[PDB]
RNA sequence: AAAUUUCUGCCCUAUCAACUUUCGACGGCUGGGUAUUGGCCAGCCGUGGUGACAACGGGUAAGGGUUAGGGCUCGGAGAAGGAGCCUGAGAAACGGCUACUACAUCCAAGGAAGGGCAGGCGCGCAAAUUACCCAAUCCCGACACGGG
RNA sequence: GUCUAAGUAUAAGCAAUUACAGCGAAACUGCGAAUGGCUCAUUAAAUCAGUUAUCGUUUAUUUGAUAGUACCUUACUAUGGAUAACCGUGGUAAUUCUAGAGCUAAUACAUGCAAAAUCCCGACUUCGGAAGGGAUGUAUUUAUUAGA
């Protein structure tokens, strides 16, 4: 019964219409994924052209990018922090696209002290912004999910840095 | 809310503003060039592609969230009268904050993909004229 | 050999110890070829991280199996994404005392090697080989991964590191 | 079929053997391509298709006890079984992952469920009686049988009128939303959306009895139980300031002693007129207890305690002693018991729904008589 | 309930008429695949023990393993199950089936002796029955005969002699066309595959080099116009 | 409930039908329970 | 105004005669109305 | 192949001037799914949108290209009834399964399978083959053959 | 329903002068059935038509091309299992009902180690052909850079 059609809606003139045609297979709406915290629970489904997409529903580790310095690592997921759409998603701790989520700091700190070597979160090219260093001494940074976990099966994204970092931290304070 | 951002231009780097032309002999306004508004539905700012149909016309409604309405009049030929009959239409287009918006002006709009139920279109040029309210009438 | 390693682990669990007991499922999921990386990130940065009490009881078996899994060539792909990123992530997620015991198990004959004496050059040592060049290039890949994923913290093992790598270099320049 | 403890042995006849199972496609691939020797005797099923391929939400057995309706997650649906015939009667699907259901009739012929997309959907064996979209988001559900009216707690604050927090209610012989039962949750951010805010603004649990008086007990996220009375349409009590979000709410068989619990994992048994606790237990870790109901061996009374850390502890009430505790090896979303005796059913985050048998508490139920002989076979094994 | 007992190690099977449900009483309350001694059956059955593998009750409903019921139970069956061949593919048909528990209500019991006693059953233990086909793959035949790397499985085959029509002609031998045999033609096909591989790659090398010198010439002419 | 069943036959001395009625049971379940009883008294004896 | 967020008190036609009220209650109502009288407040 | 999408063109009627917002009515921001764009759906707020150039409502009476001409060409819902599921590149096949309902078959009574058009009568009196082949043209398959 | 030199033949199938050879029932595999048409409440620019657009999408089949990806501490070494058909023991009153027992194949499902290899560079150069310098695919997702 779920779909994407327009036959149930009204026109630009505000007028409705029957235009009753039976719901067809290219109009298909599929049930959403509440990608939450758990071990890997990903299903695979063939689609138009038999093309398989990965519906993740429980996920534990995502790959996130410290790309202002040049690495990305597969770290664990703590839990959602904020969703711009819905506090209910924030309540039930769901992983969607563009979702700011706290993650671990151990392999990132390992890479920092492996390349630069300066201990972090405990010359001049090794430089961490102070709020990011607060996240580092907390051991749990703020990244964001920029992948579709329901439509790619995976939680990939980038760490939160600088302007968007202060923006979303202020929104946490809101 | 969330943070407005150009989706694939790296900002948080320690060591740009992407704006594209639409071509077709159009000029990206300076407000679209460097004006710090960011909207995914503007042609120069967002990643939408203008193609196909080019049109123009007169606004009747500027008072909406980045959405104007163009009243399209034409002289339909009724054969029973052997005459040309005035028929007004109503159009839809997304307003970029790049242009200065006037009411009753002649606004040039080009076709992009459908951005809502109604909007399939984007402003590319505005001609500031002294057009009056809906009492006025002209083939355009 | 993965089958050898699996029967080995079965006899390891035949040794019934309370240190190895709460992680045995993680050992089995490490040895299962379809859940290697994800079982590794279940082990580390998970809820069931290693308790430091029986950590001494659990380290040797897991380091030995992890060495064997870094060595095994069957399931690895081509390029760097074949087995190089595996060793990369292994040494990225291992501990420095675990790195000392890891280099201890990694260096078979060159664990106790001396390249410099009271004299300058130990030619009596340098005019001998304990190893084939296949295991030598593997050794150098291992220690390169060690140094790159460690960084500064390579100080307390230097007296083995420099001896091993400098013996390999001097054997190389002798053979050229 | 195994057994977790020594003295009082529980018996997981069925469930996920592995907390992280492989993909089932690769599993059957390795099965059909590999030689394997499994324990064919002791490994078996009771009932056909006792799984949901991702997880499940809520199960209930009927008042007739012949139906097993379980709501499951991947391609969200609900499996209904005739437990007399040990198979799926059918499996009907829905539009989103269900929150929680309730059976109206003594058989499965009438079901209703609160569904995550702000909906209350109804179900006959013919099909679906049309869902009602509630105004605001909700947590749980209760049913006035003596005057058929569904009531549901709601999260957030009300839009107009007061700023309490509400319990939506709709009568079955009327058809309308009668009135949201205003239950005070507290304050919220004035600059926000209409769905409330994340920090607070939730009514969580609601409990009632349907043989005794059945006072409308409500539980809200500031850790507060309120009371309404049927035929009064009004609040009766405000009580129970606690630290955690109150998750448990269940009347006893007498209809007087209440056993609530807070999301710190702290369970409290109260008398309705004694404000002092009849009993208190702070156990496990801080990971929240979810489900707590009373249960009786044919002589004594005891209590469930289900905390989501794979912790299911049966405590005593008359002595307070922890009678037994089980680790079901997975996270679990629902627990029931058979009201006959014996079996403890648990919908999990895992693949297969997992269930348990206890012999010291009760017997194998009326539809699985030979389970006593199965635990006897285990007794011959050890 | 009559008893079809098989000695599968002997390859033999035998249905036997069995009365005296008193003597059958110990078979009750037994799941399939479980071990029960035939010693309380009869005096020729001393030392004998067997597992139970299936059976059909009155009205011939077969008995699935792993189902806790004593009575007849209405199940649903998918493709890869026994007791049910699917009418079409991807098909889950719902069918009634007798449960594991050996009740009083059977007609036959499928059993298999897994260990003999000292007595020999005159028709079950006594007669040997070979596998109708031996293996076809060369590694399988090499494993059975424990052959070496040189021993010519081609002559170490198993042959079958048959007498055809034509008024009693000579016997005729049959040999199962070994699948996993490396033939020089197959080796040649591998050579041909890798030859086409290297030929493709050198052709890409040639066209890349000639395109490189061509584009060098073209940009030389372009900047010469410039 | 084993102790009650053991009382009801071993010293109260009645039959399986009145046992089925009294402690509320359909059939041979109490017979299987005494099979368990025999199992435990045999694992004690010897 | 919006999708469902307002309680449109509309009589629902199939949702009209679902279940008859079944008074399953064990006491005599005088116990409980005295009980609600002398709850915590009294 | 399939799938959206743009401008134009409907027939009549004001005893049809207000309508839409009554499953959002229009935006714009964010998420979900879809092969993708899309209030298509879920959170956020803004205000609409159409109409006396004829909205909206009513009525049912459901054409286009090939141009001396006529010719010739093209042109929604269901498979006993609702509900759910299953293959495939493409179906929500009506091909299947499951429940409910309703018939209704055999039976040794414990069980088990299943639901079409065509024809003749339709007063007791009446009127067109129960023909044959895939021979040609065309269509489908491991495929020169097989089936239509 | 579906067979070609070019899938799997031990039919204890026919026909003959040495794993196999021809014909070849059966069975597995792959293809098929998005139609041929039958019924009946209609569809009043929503279909439909012209006219665009996909820089917003999926595509078995067609033919065209199409893959540089070694080594990487085992020091050692052209691979697996099922099962069908088949042989037998039955059950029931029984339908595409099928139980037990014993076989065997894949273009069915499954894994898959020679000091070289291959690129880009090349100093010197007799067109010599080369010292020796660097480096090791693809599919998925995210971030960055280039895109002159």
DSSP readout, D289-328?
EEE--EEE-SS-EEE--EETTTEEEEEESSS--EEEEE--
What lies within 8 Å, CB to CB, of D350 at 6+ separation is D15, D16, D19, D21, D55, D330, D331
- Report the alpha-carbon distance of residue D8 to residue D324 in Å, rounded: 7
- Report the alpha-carbon distance of residue A160 to residue E93 in Å, rounded: 54
- Report the alpha-carbon distance of residue E134 to residue E140 in Å, rounded: 9
SS (H, E, C) chain A: CCECCCCCCECCCCCECCCCCCCCHHHECCCCCCCEECCCEEEEECCCCCCCEEEEEEECEEEEEECCCCEEEEEEEEEEEECCCCHHHHHHCCCCCCEEEEEECHHHHHHHHHHCCCCCCCCCCCCCCHHHHHHHHHCEEEEEECCCHHHHCCCEEEECCHHHHHHHHHHHHC
- Report the alpha-carbon distance of residue E80 to residue B113 in Å, rounded: 49
Across the interface, whether the CB atoms of C29 and D22 are under 8 A apart is answered no
What lies within 8 Å, CB to CB, of G28 at 6+ separation is none
Element spanning D181, H or E: strand D181-182
The answer to whether E113 and E50 are in contact (CB under 8 A) is yes
What is the CA angle C16-C17-C23, rounded to 5? Answer: 105
Q: Tell me the C-alpha to C-alpha distance, in Å, between residue D232 and each of D167, D227, D363, G19.
A: 15, 11, 42, 21
- Report the alpha-carbon distance of residue A106 to residue C44 in Å, rounded: 10
- Report the alpha-carbon distance of residue A12 to residue B118 in Å, rounded: 7
Q: Which of D68, D47, D50 is nearest to D59 (CA)?
A: D68
- Report the alpha-carbon distance of residue A91 to residue A37 in Å, rounded: 12
What lies within 8 Å, CB to CB, of E201 at 6+ separation is none
**Which bases of chain H are contacted by protein, using any atom under 7 A from a CB?**
2-10, 19-57, 76-78, 81-92, 95-101, 110-113
Burial of B110 (0-12, 13-18, 19+ CB in 10 A): buried
Element spanning D277, H or E: strand D277-282
Please tell me what resolution, in angstroms, this structure has: 4.4
- Report the alpha-carbon distance of residue D269 to residue D263 in Å, rounded: 15
**CA dihedral for D104, D106, D110, D115, sign (positive or negative):** positive
**CA dihedral for C70, C72, C73, C77, sign (positive or negative):** negative
Quote the strand ranges of chain B, DSSP E: 54-61, 67-78, 83-90, 93-94, 106-111, 121-127
- Report the alpha-carbon distance of residue D122 to residue D107 in Å, rounded: 14
3-class secondary structure, D185:
coil
Q: How many CB atoms lie within 10 A of CB B82?
A: 7
Element spanning F34, H or E: helix F29-44
The answer to whether C28 and C39 are in contact (CB under 8 A) is no
Strand order in D277-282's β-sheet? D246-248, D258-262, D266-270, D277-282
Regarding chains B and E, contact by 3 or more CB pairs under 8 A is answered as no
Residues C52-74 as b or e (16 or more Cβ within 10 Å = b)? eebeeebbebbbbbbebbbebee
**CA dihedral for D69, D72, D75, D81, sign (positive or negative):** negative
Q: Which of D67, D74, D50 is nearest to D101 (CA)?
A: D67
Q: Which of D91, D131, D86, D132 is nearest to D108 (CA)?
A: D91
Residues G2-32 as b or e (16 or more Cβ within 10 Å = b)? eeeeebeeeeeeebeebeeeeeebeeeeeeb
The answer to whether G42 and D237 are in contact (CB under 8 A) is no
The answer to whether D267 and D284 are in contact (CB under 8 A) is no
- Report the alpha-carbon distance of residue C161 to residue C155 in Å, rounded: 9
Query: What experiment produced this structure?
Result: cryo-EM
Q: Tell me the C-alpha to C-alpha distance, in Å, between residue A58 and each of A62, A92, E1.
A: 12, 12, 52
Q: Tell me the C-alpha to C-alpha distance, in Å, between residue B74 and each of A14, B106, B119, D363.
A: 23, 15, 21, 86
- Give residue for tokens 């000639």: E210
Pair type for strands E106-115 and E2-7 = parallel
- Report the alpha-carbon distance of residue C76 to residue C73 in Å, rounded: 6
Burial of C122 (0-12, 13-18, 19+ CB in 10 A): middle
- Report the alpha-carbon distance of residue A7 to residue B34 in Å, rounded: 42
- Report the alpha-carbon distance of residue C98 to residue D143 in Å, rounded: 59
What is the CA angle B59-B62-B68, rounded to 5? Answer: 60
Q: Tell me the C-alpha to C-alpha distance, in Å, between residue A119 and each of A114, A131, C156, D21, D234.
A: 9, 16, 17, 39, 62
Q: Which two tokens stand for residue D331?
A: 């996270």
Interface of D with C (CB under 8 A): 18-20, 22, 26
Q: Tell me the C-alpha to C-alpha distance, in Å, between residue E104 and each of E2, E22, E101, E108, G33.
A: 12, 11, 9, 11, 59
The answer to whether E102 and E29 are in contact (CB under 8 A) is yes
- Report the alpha-carbon distance of residue C109 to residue C139 in Å, rounded: 11
- Give residue for tokens 């045995």: C24
The answer to whether D110 and D104 are in contact (CB under 8 A) is yes
3-class secondary structure, D258:
strand
Q: Which two tokens stand for residue D335?
A: 């627990």
Burial of E124 (0-12, 13-18, 19+ CB in 10 A): middle
- What's the gap between Cα A64 and its chain centre? 10
3-class secondary structure, D259:
strand
D373 to chain F: which residues are within 8 Å by CB? 32, 35
- Report the alpha-carbon distance of residue E77 to residue D88 in Å, rounded: 11
Q: How many CB atoms lie within 10 A of CB D116?
A: 19
**CA dihedral for B100, B104, B108, B110, sign (positive or negative):** positive
First to last CA, chain C: 34
Element spanning C150, H or E: helix C133-150
- What's the gap between Cα D188 and its chain centre? 29
Helices (H) and strands (E) in chain G, counts: 1, 0
Q: Which two tokens stand for residue E92?
A: 């889950």
D42 in contact with F, Cβ within 8 Å? no
- Residues in chain D, total: 382
Helix axes C133-150, C84-93, angle to 10 degrees: 50
- Give residue for tokens 């957030």: D156
- Report the alpha-carbon distance of residue D147 to residue D171 in Å, rounded: 8
A126 in contact with D, Cβ within 8 Å? no
Element spanning C138, H or E: helix C133-150
3-class secondary structure, C22:
helix
- Residues in chain F, total: 46
- Give residue for tokens 């309370």: C18
Interface of D with G (CB under 8 A): 104-105, 110, 118, 122, 129-130, 132-136, 145-148, 159, 168, 170, 172-177, 180, 194, 210-214, 227, 229, 232, 236-237, 239, 255, 272-273, 275
DSSP letter, residue D161? S
Across the interface, whether the CB atoms of A41 and D55 are under 8 A apart is answered yes
The answer to whether D312 and D328 are in contact (CB under 8 A) is yes
Strand H: which of residues 47-66 in chain E lie with Cβ below 7 A? 59
Pair type for strands B93-94 and E106-115 = unpaired
Burial of E115 (0-12, 13-18, 19+ CB in 10 A): middle
**Which bases of chain I are contacted by protein, using any atom under 7 A from a CB?**
8-20, 46, 52-60, 66-75, 78-82, 85-94, 96-107, 109-113, 115, 119-120, 136-145
D25 to chain A: which residues are within 8 Å by CB? 44
What phi and psi values does residue E5 have, to the nearest 5 degrees? Answer: -105, 130
**CA dihedral for D238, D241, D246, D249, sign (positive or negative):** negative
Burial of D113 (0-12, 13-18, 19+ CB in 10 A): buried
Q: Which of D145, D137, D143 is nearest to D99 (CA)?
A: D137
The answer to whether F41 and F34 are in contact (CB under 8 A) is no
Breaks (C–N over 2.5 Å) after residues, chain A: 122
DSSP letter, residue D243? S
Q: Which two tokens stand for residue D42?
A: 């002791």
Element spanning D205, H or E: strand D203-207
Residue E138 exposure: Cα atoms within 13 Å on the Cβ side? 15
SS (H, E, C) chain E: CEEEEEECCCCEEEEECCCCHHHHHHHCCCCCCCEEECCCCCHHHCCCEEEEEEEEEHHHCEECCCCCCCCEEEEEECCCCCCCCCCCCCCCEEEEEECCCCCCCEEEEEEEEEECCCCCCCCCCCCCCCCCCCCCCHHHHHHHCCCCCCCCCCCCCCCEEECCCCCCCCCEEECCCCCCCCCHHHHHHHHHHHHHHHHHHHHHHHHHHHHHHHHHHHHHHHHHHC
What phi and psi values does residue B94 have, to the nearest 5 degrees? Answer: -90, 135
Amino acid E124 CA to nucleotide I14 C1' distance, rounded Å: 36
Q: How many CB atoms lie within 10 A of CB D342?
A: 21
- Report the alpha-carbon distance of residue D305 to residue D268 in Å, rounded: 11
- Give residue for tokens 């034509």: E166
Q: Tell me the C-alpha to C-alpha distance, in Å, between residue D177 and each of A81, D27, D205, D215, E124.
A: 35, 49, 20, 20, 77
Element spanning D133, H or E: strand D128-133
B35-41, long-range: CB < 8 A, 24+ apart: B35/B97, B35/B98, B37/B97, B37/B98, B38/B4, B38/B5, B38/B6, B39/B4, B39/B66, B39/B96, B39/B97, B40/B7, B41/B66, B41/B94, B41/B96, B41/B115, B41/B119, B41/B122
**CA dihedral for A174, B2, B6, B8, sign (positive or negative):** positive
First to last CA, chain B: 41
């Amino acid at each position: 019964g779920i779909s994407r059609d327009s036959r149930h809606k009204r026109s630009h003139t505000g007028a409705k219409r029957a235009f009753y045609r039976k719901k067809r297979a290219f109009e298909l709406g599929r049930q959403p994924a509440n990608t939450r915290i758990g071990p890997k629970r990903i299903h695979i489904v063939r689609t138009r052209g038999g093309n398989h997409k990965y519906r993740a529903l429980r996920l534990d580790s995502g790959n996130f990018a410290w790309g202002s310095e040049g690495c990305t690592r597969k770290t664990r997921i703590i839990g959602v922090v904020y969703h711009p759409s819905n506090n209910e998603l924030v309540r039930t701790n769901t992983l969607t696209k563009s979702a700011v989520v706290q993650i671990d700091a151990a392999p990132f700190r390992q890479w920092y002290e492996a390349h630069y070597g300066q201990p972090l979160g405990r010359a001049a090219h090794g430089k961490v912004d102070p709020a990011l260093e607060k996240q580092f001494e907390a051991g749990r940074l703020y990244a964001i999910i920029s992948s579709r976990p329901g439509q790619s099966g995976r939680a990939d994204g980038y760490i939160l840095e600088g302007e968007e970092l202060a923006f979303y931290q202020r929104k946490l304070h809101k | 809310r969330a943070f407005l951002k150009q989706p694939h231009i790296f900002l948080n780097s320690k060591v740009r503003r992407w704006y594209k032309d639409v071509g077709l002999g159009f000029k990206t306004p300076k407000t679209a060039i460097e004006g710090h508004y960011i909207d995914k539905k503007c042609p120069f700012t967002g990643m939408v592609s203008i193609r196909g149909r080019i049109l123009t016309g007169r606004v009747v409604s500027t008072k909406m969230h980045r959405t104007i309405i163009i009243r399209r009049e034409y002289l339909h030929y009724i054969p029973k009268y052997n005459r040309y009959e005035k028929r007004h239409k109503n159009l839809a287009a997304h307003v970029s904050p790049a242009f200065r918006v006037e009411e009753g002006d002649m606004v040039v709009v080009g076709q992009c993909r459908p951005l809502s139920k109604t909007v399939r279109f984007n402003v590319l040029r505005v001609l500031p004229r002294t057009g009056k309210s809906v009492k006025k009438f002209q083939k355009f | 050999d993965i089958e050898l390693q699996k029967l080995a682990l079965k006899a390891i669990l035949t040794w019934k110890s309370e240190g190895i007991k709460p992680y045995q499922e993680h050992l089995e999921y490490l040895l299962d070829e379809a859940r290697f990386k994800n079982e590794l990130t279940v082990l580390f940065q998970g809820d069931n991280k290693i308790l430091p009490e029986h950590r001494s009881e659990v380290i040797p078996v897991l380091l030995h199996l992890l060495y064997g899994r870094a060595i095994s060539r069957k399931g690895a792909a081509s390029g760097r994404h074949g087995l190089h990123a595996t060793r990369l992530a292994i040494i990225r997620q291992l501990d420095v005392e675990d790195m000392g015991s890891f280099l201890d198990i990694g260096l078979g004959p060159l664990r106790a090697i001396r390249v410099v004496d009271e004299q300058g050059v130990r030619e009596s040592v340098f005019a001998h080989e304990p190893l084939p060049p296949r295991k030598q290039v593997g050794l150098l890949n291992m220690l390169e991964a060690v140094i790159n994923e460690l960084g500064t913290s390579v100080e307390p093992y230097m007296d083995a590191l420099v001896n091993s790598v400098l013996y390999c270099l001097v054997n190389a320049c002798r053979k050229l | 079929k195994l057994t977790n403890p020594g003295p009082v042995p529980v018996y997981t006849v069925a469930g996920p053997s592995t907390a992280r199972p492989l993909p089932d496609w690769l599993l059957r691939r390795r099965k059909r391509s590999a030689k394997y020797d499994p324990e064919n005797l002791n490994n078996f099923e009771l009932i056909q298709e006792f799984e949901f391929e991702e997880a499940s939400n809520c199960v209930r057995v009927s008042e007739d006890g012949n139906w097993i309706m379980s709501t499951g997650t991947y391609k969200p649906q609900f499996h209904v079984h005739n437990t007399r015939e040990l198979s799926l009667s059918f499996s009907r699907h829905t539009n989103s992952e269900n929150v929680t259901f309730l059976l109206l009739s003594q058989d499965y012929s009438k079901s209703v469920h609160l569904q995550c997309d702000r909906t209350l959907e109804f179900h006959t064996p013919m099909g679906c009686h049309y869902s009602i979209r509630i105004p605001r988001f909700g947590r749980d559900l209760a049913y006035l049988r003596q005057s058929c009216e569904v009531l549901v707690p709601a999260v957030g604050l009300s839009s107009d009128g007061s700023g309490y927090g509400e319990v939506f209610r709709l009568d079955l012989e009327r058809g309308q939303f009668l009135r949201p039962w205003q239950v005070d949750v507290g304050e919220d951010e004035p600059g926000s959306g209409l769905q409330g805010s994340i920090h607070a603004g939730a009514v969580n649990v609601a409990a009632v009895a349907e043989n005794t008086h059945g006072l409308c007990a409500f539980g809200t996220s500031i850790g507060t139980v309120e009371f309404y009375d049927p035929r009064s349409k009004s609040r009766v009590a405000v009580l129970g300031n606690q630290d955690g979000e109150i998750t448990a709410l269940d009347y006893s068989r007498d209809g007087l002693s209440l056993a609530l619990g807070t999301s710190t994992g702290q369970i409290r048994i109260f008398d309705l007129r004694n404000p002092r606790p009849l009993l208190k237990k702070d156990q496990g870790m801080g990971l929240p207890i979810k489900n707590l109901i009373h249960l009786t061996t044919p002589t004594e009374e005891r209590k469930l305690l289900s905390a989501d850390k794979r912790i299911i502890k049966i405590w005593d009430e008359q002595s307070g002693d922890l009678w037994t505790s089980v680790e079901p090896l997975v996270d679990l979303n629902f627990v029931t018991h058979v009201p006959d005796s014996g079996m403890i059913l648990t919908a999990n985050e895992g693949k297969q729904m997992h269930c348990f048998f206890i012999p010291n508490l009760g017997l194998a139920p009326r539809w699985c008589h030979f389970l006593d002989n199965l635990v006897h076979e285990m007794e011959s094994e050890k | 309930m009559k008893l079809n007992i098989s000695h599968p190690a002997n390859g033999s099977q035998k249905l036997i008429e069995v009365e005296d449900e008193r003597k059958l009483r110990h078979f009750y309350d037994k799941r399939m695949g479980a071990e029960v001694a035939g010693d309380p059956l009869g005096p020729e059955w001393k030392g004998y023990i067997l597992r139970i593998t299936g059976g059909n009750d009155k009205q011939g409903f077969p008995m699935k393993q792993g189902v806790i019921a004593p009575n007849r139970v209405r199940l649903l069956l998918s493709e890869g199950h026994s007791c049910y061949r699917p009418r079409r593919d991807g098909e889950r048909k719902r069918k009634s089936v007798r449960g594991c528990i050996v009740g009083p209500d059977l007609s036959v019991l499928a059993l298999s002796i897994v260990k003999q006693g000292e007595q020999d059953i005159p028709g079950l233990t006594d007669v040997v029955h070979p596998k109708r086909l031996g293996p076809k793959r060369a590694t399988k035949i090499r494993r059975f005969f424990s052959l070496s790397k040189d021993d010519d499985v081609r002559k170490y085959v198993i042959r079958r002699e048959v007498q055809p029509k034509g008024e009693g002609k000579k016997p005729y031998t049959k040999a199962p066309r070994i699948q996993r045999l490396v033939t020089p033609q197959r080796l040649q096909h591998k050579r041909h595959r890798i030859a086409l591989k290297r030929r493709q790659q050198e052709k890409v090398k040639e066209e890349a080099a000639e395109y490189a010198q061509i584009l060098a010439k073209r940009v030389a002419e372009a900047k010469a116009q410039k | 409930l084993q102790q009650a069943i053991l009382l009801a036959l071993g010293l109260q001395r009645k039959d399986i039908d009145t046992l089925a009625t009294e402690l509320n049971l359909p059939g041979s379940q109490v017979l299987a329970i005494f099979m368990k009883i025999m199992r435990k008294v045999t694992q004690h004896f010897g | 105004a919006s999708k469902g967020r307002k309680l449109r008190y509309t009589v629902h036609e199939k949702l009209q005669n679902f279940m008859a009220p079944e008074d399953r209650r064990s006491w005599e109502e005088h116990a409980i109305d005295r009980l609600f009288g002398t709850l915590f407040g009294q």
